[PDB]
């Protein structure tokens, strides 16, 4: 029962039938259908062969629209007449007209209210956009309703930026320039977002806290929940998502100053006037957000495959199960992959095989509401994972395109993937007879090494956050995605829309379910190697190179102002010395492993412990400034996220516009000192024990 025995039990037909099963009825967090799906998944995993499958439930705060009083945006004239209403519901896709329990598009946790005022265009609603708006063109956004497009920055940052500018309310729309791909038809003819299409999402700023009412501790049945006023990241002004048919037919009358540049203008046939006023100007818009926030229960599925030799070691494979409406891509295209992997491991166990280490299979809940399922489970099991967790693998949205296989993980995994992809067959068009490694390298080369595929950084934003930004467990993700040099749009056009159906995947994305098969193969090989290898496939020499690169980047970001560094005596020599010591100690450790004999079990356990706890050595118990739950000194999210060393980046952001330069540069020095100490301590953990 080697790697091939498990690898050849993966079949595309099973993935296809599982995906068809999942994407039929709405599966929203806190709804009954999600509970039924969780029960079905638990029963199927028990059938597959896992020793024990159980349900973990948490009571967390979610938000729902008021079905009796649906949310909408209207235009009222001078005498109180609704001369204009937006769509109350996204038009259902063909074949799903009779499907019920489809919540209309809405922004989760949006505060209730009835704001009314003039409109103003703020483009992507980034900080620079408000900078150009009011500090340059002299247009105060206070007491106004801002209109923004979906874009690169996360929507919670958009709403907070609108909040600090005093805006009455925010209106987010998915511009065709950012989502409507050229040439391809709209759904159901193609896969583009139609005018009725609206993108749902949550607009809070949790900063890795999980449940807004129970930050840092699990939301059990005896948890104490803070007041709504003192919550974490809850917005203060109403926000509502809108499709571009409503918007194009909304901002025609908007009149005022000309757009600052072509960047502000999108693709609609709208003048895109930035100044306040409707030019037909006495009328004003009014929003009717009636959303309600309540505490509801969410359920996570946890299945166990106990190890044979090392039951103390946990290798976790997981993903979320909730969806906004259907989830043909996010997340059921990954849930089917997880189901197939679990079935393969179960039949492998049934023939008599059993891995050295424990394997935990996870199905998360309330992830679209702020990662409220994985975070709470990790908070409950913080100690077990801290002292035992080897690695975590996240499976979600196996398909986002049909061009390349993207992988993002900690550097310790870099070598392992290169060994894994060299065996699996490439499913790409052409490239017949080649391994997955060859196709991946050809279609996504690394800038540093021509013959090596590029592996991206593990940027936060999904279920791996609590396992990598707070606990410090080596996390990895692999999924098929599109070209980046030719496809300008971000994600897929039908993201968080109502048209994420099984027909979409079966027709335009994965007709033969071969990319699903190869993504399942990648994830399953990752878990199998991590749970069955004698020596953990971790390489610190891969971490050293990226440490050097990150230090070189942050040094330039600081050296942006050389005369200011010289005036206040800012130096990076401690960080450079720590990184150099890391490289030397990692070299010695690698040679020790190569010399090492594997017959003696206890010393093998010691060596594997040294390999395992390397990632935990980058965790600062005090966390980043004002963000207690972002603790990974190297990869924690920045306060201006989209670079590594978040502390130094945060201290170096907007230092020119500071009242007291000495205090700011002292903070920069403090962050440099913290980073250097953490790197040196991580290096010292790998030195000769005793």
């Amino acid at each position, epitope marked *: 029962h080697n790697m091939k025995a498990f690898l050849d039990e993966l079949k595309a037909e099973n993935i296809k039938k599982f995906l068809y099963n999942f994407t039929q009825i709405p599966h929203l967090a806190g709804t009954e259908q999600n509970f039924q799906l969780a029960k079905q998944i638990q029963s199927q995993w028990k059938e597959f062969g896992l020793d024990s499958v159980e349900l973990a439930h948490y009571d967390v705060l979610l938000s729902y629209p008021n079905k009796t009083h649906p949310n909408y945006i209207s235009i009222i004239n001078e005498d109180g007449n609704e001369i204009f209403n937006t769509s109350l519901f996204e038009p259902p896709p063909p074949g799903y007209e009779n499907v019920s329990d489809i919540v209309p598009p809405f922004s989760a946790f949006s505060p209730q209210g009835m704001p009314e005022g003039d409109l103003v265009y703020v483009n992507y609603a980034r900080t620079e956009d408000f900078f150009k708006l009011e500090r340059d063109m002299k247009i105060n956004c206070s007491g106004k309703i801002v209109i923004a497009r979906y874009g690169k920055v996360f929507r919670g940052n958009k709403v907070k930026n609108a909040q600090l500018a005093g805006a009455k309310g925010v209106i987010l729309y998915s511009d065709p320039a950012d989502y409507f791909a050229p040439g391809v038809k709209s759904y159901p003819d193609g896969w583009n977002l139609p005018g009725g299409g609206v993108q749902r999402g949550n607009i809070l700023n949790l900063n890795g806290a999980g449940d807004p009412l129970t930050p840092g501790y699990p939301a059990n049945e005896y948890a104490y929940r803070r007041g709504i006023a003192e919550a974490v990241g809850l917005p203060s002004i109403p926000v509502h998502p809108i499709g571009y048919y409503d918007a194009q037919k909304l901002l025609e009358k908007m009149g005022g100053s000309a757009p600052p540049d072509s960047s502000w203008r999108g693709s609609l046939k709208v003048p895109y006037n930035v100044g306040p006023g409707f030019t037909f100007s006495t009328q004003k818009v009014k929003m009717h957000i009636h959303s309600t926030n309540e505490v509801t229960r969410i359920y996570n599925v946890i299945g166990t495959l106990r190890g044979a030799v090392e039951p103390d070691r946990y290798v976790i494979l997981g993903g979320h199960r909730d969806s906004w409406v259907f989830g043909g891509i996010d997340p059921q295209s990954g849930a089917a992959v997880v189901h197939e992997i679990v079935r393969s491991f179960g039949t492998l166990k049934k023939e008599g095989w059993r891995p050295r280490r424990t394997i935990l299979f996870a199905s998360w809940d309330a992830e679209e509401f702020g990662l409220l399922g994985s975070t709470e489970w990790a908070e409950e099991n913080s100690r077990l994972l801290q002292e035992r967790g080897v690695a975590y693998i996240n499976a979600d949205s196996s398909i986002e395109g049909n061009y390349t296989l993207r992988v993002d993980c900690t550097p310790l995994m870099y070598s392992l993937v290169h060994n894994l992809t060299k065996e699996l067959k490439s499913p790409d068009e052409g490239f017949e007879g080649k391994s997955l490694y060859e196709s991946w390298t050809k279609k996504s080369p690394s800038p540093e090494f021509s013959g090596m595929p590029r592996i991206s950084k593990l940027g936060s934003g999904n279920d791996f956050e609590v396992f990598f930004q707070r606990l410090g467990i080596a996390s990895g993700r692999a999924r098929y995605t599109k070209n980046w040099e030719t496809n300008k749009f971000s994600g897929y056009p039908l993201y968080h829309s109502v048209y994420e159906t099984y027909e979409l995947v079966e027709k335009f994305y994965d007709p033969m379910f071969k990319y699903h098969l190869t993504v399942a193969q990648v994830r399953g090989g990752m878990v199998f190697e991590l749970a069955n290898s004698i020596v953990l496939p971790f390489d610190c020499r891969d971490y050293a190179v990226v440490l050097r*690169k990150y230090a070189d980047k942050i040094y330039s970001i600081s050296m942006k102002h050389p005369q200011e560094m010289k005036t206040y005596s800012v130096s990076f020599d401690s960080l450079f010395s720590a990184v150099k010591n890391f490289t030397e100690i990692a070299s010695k450790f690698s040679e020790r492993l190569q010399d090492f004999d594997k017959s003696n079990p206890i010393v093998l356990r010691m060596m594997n412990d040294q390999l395992m706890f390397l990632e935990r050595a980058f965790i600062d118990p005090l966390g980043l400034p004002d963000r207690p739950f972002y603790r990974h000194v190297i990869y924690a999210p920045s306060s201006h996220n989209k670079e590594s060393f978040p502390g130094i980046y945060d201290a170096l952001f907007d230092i020119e516009s500071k009242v007291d330069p000495s205090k700011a540069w002292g903070e920069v020095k403090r962050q440099i000192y913290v980073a250097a100490f953490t790197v040196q301590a991580a290096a010292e953990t790998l030195s000769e024990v005793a």
Partner: nanobody
Amino acid sequence: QVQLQESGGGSVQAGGSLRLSCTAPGYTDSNYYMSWFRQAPGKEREWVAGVNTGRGSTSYADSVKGRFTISQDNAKNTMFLQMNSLKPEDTAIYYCAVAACHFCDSLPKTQDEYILWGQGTQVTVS
């Protein structure tokens, strides 16, 4: 904030030998990723040439190779390009880019990897 005061642009016939200098004040006592990016009229920005002072290795693009050379000035914080035998259709505004490095393992060849930028100018006629 430093603006890498640079000069050396011009407009001559194709095949001419031009020389563009770029210096980074405050970078005299440090290594960096000195490099250049072209901006054709209507096209995008692409890598052209660069030097890694940490290892002192100079690299050029496949098309650029054999036509561009980099020379270091007496002052450490200053590099020169000599463009000899300019092709008829290399008319593109040059952008000098540089990021300070200490270990200086690899030379970035992407625009987004460079921190502090400049505004050059270059036009070549037939």
